[PDB]
């Protein structure tokens, strides 16, 4: 009778159609949101970008390549004349046309130079692109890159005090002897630099021989546990390090890196000096901050051209 009104409480007729609508959109919408991803994944198909990079050209030494093109003090695979694996070197080219190469650097105290023999040979630490990064290319590599066919190399002990002024000190036909003889460094003569020649010994007063016993020229390389120095023990260890000891030193670079520099007979592990010294510039107590050391061909020292 009256209930024939059901065609009234029958409102779902579209109280539903508004779903067979909002529904039909989502899925449809998804055909769009299924591109709004297909493209993002492709935007995430690469690696983080890395600063450090190896250049294309390579040759004899940094100086060879630095004269085949080059101009960017960077890292290049070099394979010395009578060399092997083209290990990686941290070059340093100028504007003139001469390619250097460090072999040891110090700047912060981030590479605890106190590594055992087989580490000072193969080198330890870490290179880098720019430069700031204490590293020991390692006597091994320092050899083949100091005697390729034997043409005059040279060290330029570049430096800097804990107060600005930097020095530098050169040497002749620089050459680190093969592990055989050991790592005994062989320079002919001193060649300038107000850095002070501390490889030529230095008299500390203690005894007239403070100078003959702390001379480094032609002094085999000692490690904390493999010392061929002229001592009754291991200066290296005695001071904890791996320099070119004698009985003992004056000009300790691979030594105890100190925050500030000037240290005391208190931090001295065993007592004596072991910091970053160079009696021919600063005393045995004052350690340095910056402290590189780099080879390079000699016939380019005073090149003019």
């Amino acid at each position: 009778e009256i209930m024939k009104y059901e065609a009234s409480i029958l409102t779902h007729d579209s109280s539903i159609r508004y779903l067979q609508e909002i529904y039909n959109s989502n899925n449809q919408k998804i055909v769009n949101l299924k591109e709004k991803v297909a493209q993002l994944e492709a935007q995430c198909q690469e690696p983080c970008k890395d600063t450090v990079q190896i250049h294309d050209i390579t040759g004899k030494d940094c100086q060879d390549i630095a004269n085949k093109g080059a101009k960017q003090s960077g890292l290049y695979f070099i394979k010395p004349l009578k060399a092997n694996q083209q290990f990686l070197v941290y070059c340093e080219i100028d504007g003139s046309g001469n390619g250097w190469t460090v072999f040891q650097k110090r700047l912060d105290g981030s590479v605890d130079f106190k590594k055992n023999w087989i580490q000072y040979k193969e080198g330890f630490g870490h290179l880098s692109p720019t430069g700031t990064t204490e590293f020991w290319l390692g006597n091994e590599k320092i050899h083949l890159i100091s005697t390729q066919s034997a043409i005059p190399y040279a060290l330029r002990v570049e430096l800097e005090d804990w107060n600005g002024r930097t020095s530098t000190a050169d040497y002749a036909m620089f050459k680190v002897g093969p592990e055989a003889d050991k790592y005994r460094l062989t320079y002919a003569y001193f060649a300038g630099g107000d850095a002070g020649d501390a490889f030529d010994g230095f008299d500390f007063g203690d005894d007239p021989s403070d100078k003959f016993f702390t001379s480094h020229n032609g002094m085999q390389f000692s490690t904390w546990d493999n010392d061929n120095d002229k001592f009754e023990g291991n200066c290296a260890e005695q001071d904890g390090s791996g320099w070119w000891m004698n009985k003992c030193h004056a000009g300790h670079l691979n030594g105890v890196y100190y925050q500030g520099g000037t240290y005391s007979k208190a931090s001295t592990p065993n007592g004596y000096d072991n910091g970053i010294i160079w009696a021919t510039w600063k005393t045995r107590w004052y350690s340095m901050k910056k402290t590189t050391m780099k080879i390079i061909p000699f016939n380019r020292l005073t090149i003019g051209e």
């Binding site: 500390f204 203690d206 005894d207 016993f213 001592f231 009985k247 003992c248 009696a279």
Partner: peptide, 4 residues
């Protein structure tokens, strides 16, 4: 450096 200098020792005995």
């Amino acid at each position: 450096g200098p020792r005995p």
